[PDB]
Design a binder for this molecule. Structure first.
Ligand SMILES: Nc1ncnc2c1ncn2[C@@H]1O[C@H](COP(=O)(O)OP(=O)(O)O)[C@@H](O)[C@H]1O
Ligand SMILES: [Mg+2]
Lengths: 174, 637, 27
């Protein structure tokens, strides 16, 4: 505590992550949301790169301001410290990742089938913890929360097939 | 380097201090007191310490309260810094000739942290705990060098070095064994400047489980407590104590490769001497203005003496003049210290010789329970070694040395050895104990009033015989007793039925918060040595009876704020009564000596103290001589 | 014990100690 002292920075990452998720799910100004359309494409394996436009985030913040809601400056936070927001946006995309509408066939990449295999394996190990603890007979919320403490799953960075990039916000659109 | 959490806790405790204004009031009062006698003398300086009520902290911020109780090393330093900042903020008028660190002390309900040396285990380590026990050892109050100031004569410059140990902070530092500077950086020889270096008082006491709560037949448990710069000399060996402090672990416990286990002790934050019966701690009581007003209001009454006499032991029937004598002894006279060095005794001794079951021991137990400072002893249960001092190259105070400025209740006085009797002879008149043993020539103060109970030779006071044969005590010893009461169990029908109705009424008593068939609980009454005047339960059914706590308050007020002066109008009565008692032939129970003149004077002074009068008037001398004539003869005039 | 405690908290603990006793023959 005396060593490695704490500092008070104006950056709150919890509501910044909430804003990131809201922007990913609700932004549609560029038929539905642009970014879930892109994540749906990624799920079906037509795209392996996610480009996050800073113009889109700035426009989303401007629209939120126009309707009266006070939104944190996500664009400025990304510009000041961009390494953390690649990490953040990847987690947010993983949370809102649509299920693929195309099944895995023999013409898919080896990386895609490996990721599908480990995803199914970790969901099966979750289910196996759950069934074992149910058989032990010791609320489903607590049961689940025990399961994710006693599971060694594949982390999201190992079940991840896309790449994240930040397109700078245009000078005219600044 | 500054810590964000540290500042957050500092500002939270500053908010707490702002919410409860009593803490600015206390700090402001301390600062103005210090400044006022600093400017007065260019008495004593109050410490920079504030008592913090943990209940108020729990009301304000429960997590700050739980943080202090459970994680003191992370919550107490920020709170102390907040208090210091607040004190330096109010310090618009600095003392003549942040700064001046203010320490914190805690009080209130500790819950599971209120422990004893036996129940204080290793899972209480690094916690703020309140430990109740008995002080068995008090080390020497040794100075600790916290800053050494040196002088370099070649450069003519003053240097300094600050020293830090593991016990001065709640958090662990990096150890920095800075050596004592014997020379400057560049080779100049340094001279230590004592009087400019800073030394902090340090004491290490040992707190052991109290005998009244420790298991019988089992070896007691002890805990070390370290006191620094204002808690030193707050207690003495044998004192009941409540120490609030952080249960710290120190050293490495044998892990650091150079002990069986880690060295654990309590960093004392607060020391409360507790009042337990038959202990050496007096009973300070808080006297509000309402209490003083009531005391003066009752003192204005004429029969207040009687009101105080009957309210002593309502449960005991009769023994009314014995109760009057007991009240006078509780007040007592005023001792005289003449310029040449001689001493005149101002303490009243009482002896009660009587038949079995006339409540002599209940009247002793009541005095033990109600007196400000009372020690209970039994004949041959405590010897002269146990009554007076004892050499251990060091002295251990006995029964009558711990009871200095107090009362000694000796039961079974007749069953006392002559070796004890000679020491008692010295203690009663000269009020001193001269050891002169094993190279220790010391005169301890034993200014105590002795009340004692005794049985006759044959176990029944024979009215046919004379008192001198019924007592079987040395005449020189009986002279020291200011008032000797012989009580006889005479079988008379009126008082037989009256005492039996009283005994049954007392047995038919219920506390306000108890059921008809609920066993009354009983605690040990560990009072802190710092709401109606009259009593609802009256065994007699009649004047009014005051409550025992109010009677203790009245006795304390009269004892500490009234010093009566003898008057000629009282002296005439005293001299006439003494001359008559000396010359009149009446076959007195006790002999008449010059000590009788002084028991007249002492009783007159005590009764003057009862009325809150600063002068002994004629009525005080008359009532003193009246009680004395009763005690010597049995008259009712 | 971790499983039981977490499953029972909805209507950290240290390593548990094994206090084993027996009634077998005594040396
Ligand atoms: N005069 C009395 N009035 C009330 N209770 C009395 C009286 N005399 C004796 N007792 C009762 O007798 C019991 C024993 O008295 P105690 O003080 O032990 O006698 P002693 O002085 O002979 O040792 C107590 O419960 C006490 O209340
Ligand atoms: Mg007795």
């Amino acid at each position: 505590s005396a060593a490695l002292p704490s500092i008070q920075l104006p950056v709150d990452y919890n509501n910044l992550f909430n804003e990131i998720t809201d922007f990913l799910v609700t932004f549609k100004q560029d038929k539905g949301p642009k970014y879930m359309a892109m994540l749906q494409k990624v799920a079906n394996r037509e795209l392996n790169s996610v480009i996050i436009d800073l113009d889109d985030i700035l426009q989303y913040q401007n629209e939120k301001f126009l309707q009266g809601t006070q939104a944190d400056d996500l664009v400025s936070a990304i510009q000041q410290n961009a390494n953390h927001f690649t990490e953040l946006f990847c987690r947010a995309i993983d949370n809102n990742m649509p299920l693929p509408t195309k099944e895995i066939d023999y013409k898919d990449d080896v990386l895609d089938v490996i990721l599908n295999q480990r995803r199914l394996r970790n969901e099966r190990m979750l289910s196996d913890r759950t069934n074992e603890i149910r058989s032990e007979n010791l609320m489903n919320d607590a049961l689940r929360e025990v399961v994710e403490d006693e599971t060694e799953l594949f982390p999201p960075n190992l079940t991840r097939r896309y790449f994240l990039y930040f397109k700078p916000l245009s000078q005219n659109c600044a | 380097a500054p810590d964000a959490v540290f500042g957050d806790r500092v500002r939270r405790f500053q908010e707490f201090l702002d919410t409860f204004t009593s803490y600015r009031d206390s700090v402001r009062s301390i600062q103005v007191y210090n400044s006022n006698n600093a400017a007065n003398y260019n008495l004593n300086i109050l410490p920079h310490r504030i008592i913090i009520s943990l209940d108020d902290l729990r009301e304000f911020d429960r997590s700050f309260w739980s943080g202090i109780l459970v994680e003191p090393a992370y919550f107490i330093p920020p709170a102390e810094k907040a208090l210091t900042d607040l004190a330096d903020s109010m310090d618009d008028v600095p003392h003549p000739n942040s700064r001046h660190p203010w320490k914190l002390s805690f009080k209130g309900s500790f819950g599971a942290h209120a422990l004893s040396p036996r129940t204080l285990t290793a899972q209480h380590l690094n916690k703020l705990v309140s430990v109740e026990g008995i002080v068995t050892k008090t080390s020497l109050v040794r100075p600790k060098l916290i800053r050494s100031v040196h002088y370099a004569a070649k450069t003519g410059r003053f240097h300094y070095r600050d020293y830090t140990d593991a016990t001065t902070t709640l958090t662990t530092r990096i150890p920095t064994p800075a050596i004592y500077p014997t020379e400057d950086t560049e080779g100049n020889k340094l001279t230590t400047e004592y009087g400019y270096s800073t030394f902090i008082d340090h004491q290490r006491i040992t707190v052991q489980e109290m005998p009244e709560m420790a298991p019988a037949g089992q070896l007691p448990r002890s805990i070390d407590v370290i006191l620094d710069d204002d808690l030193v000399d707050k207690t003495k060996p044998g004192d009941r104590v409540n120490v609030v402090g952080v249960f710290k672990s120190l050293g490495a416990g044998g892990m650091n490769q150079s002990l069986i286990g880690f060295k654990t002790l309590i960093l004392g934050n607060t020391v409360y001497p507790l009042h337990a019966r038959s202990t050496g701690v007096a009973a300070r009581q808080m006297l509000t203005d309402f209490d003083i007003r009531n005391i003066n209001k009752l003192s204005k009454k004429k029969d207040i003496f009687d009101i105080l006499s009957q309210s002593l032991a309502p449960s005991i029937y009769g023994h009314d003049h014995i109760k009057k004598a007991i009240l006078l002894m509780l007040m007592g006279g005023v001792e005289k210290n003449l310029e040449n060095g001689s001493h005149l005794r101002g303490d009243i001794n009482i002896l009660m010789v009587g038949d079995p079951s006339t409540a002599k021991s209940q009247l002793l137990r009541f005095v033990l329970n109600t007196a400000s400072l009372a020690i209970a002893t039994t004949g041959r249960g405590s010897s002269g070694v146990g009554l007076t001092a004892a050499v251990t190259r060091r002295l251990e105070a006995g029964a009558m040395v711990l009871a200095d400025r107090g009362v000694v209740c000796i039961d079974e006085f007749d069953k006392m050895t002559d070796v004890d009797r000679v020491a008692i002879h010295e203690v009663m008149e000269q009020q001193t104990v001269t050891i002169a043993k094993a190279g220790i020539h010391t005169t301890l103060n034993a200014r105590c009033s002795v009340i004692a109970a005794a049985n006759p030779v044959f176990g029944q006071y024979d009215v046919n015989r004379d008192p001198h044969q019924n007592i079987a005590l040395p005449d020189s010893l009986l002279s020291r007793f200011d008032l000797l009461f012989v009580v006889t169990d005479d079988i008379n029908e009126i008082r037989d039925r009256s005492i039996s109705e009283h005994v049954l009424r007392t047995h038919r008593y219920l506390p306000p918060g108890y059921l008809e068939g609920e066993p009354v609980r009983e605690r040990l009454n560990l009072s802190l040595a710092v709401d109606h005047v009259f009593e609802k339960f009256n065994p007699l059914l009649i004047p009014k009876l005051v409550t025992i706590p109010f009677l203790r308050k009245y006795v304390q007020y009269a004892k500490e704020r009234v010093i009566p002066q003898l008057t000629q109008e009282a002296i005439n009565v005293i001299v006439k009564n003494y001359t008559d008692l000396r010359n009149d032939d009446n076959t007195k129970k006790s002999p008449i000596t010059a000590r009788t003149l002084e028991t007249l004077i002492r009783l007159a002074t005590a009764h003057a103290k009862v009325r809150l009068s600063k002068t002994v008037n004629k009525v005080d001398a008359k009532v003193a001589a009246n009680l004395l004539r009763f005690a010597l003869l049995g008259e009712d005039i | 014990a971790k499983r039981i405690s977490i499953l029972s908290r909805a209507q950290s603990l240290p390593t548990f100690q094994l206090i084993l006793n027996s009634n077998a023959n005594q040396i």
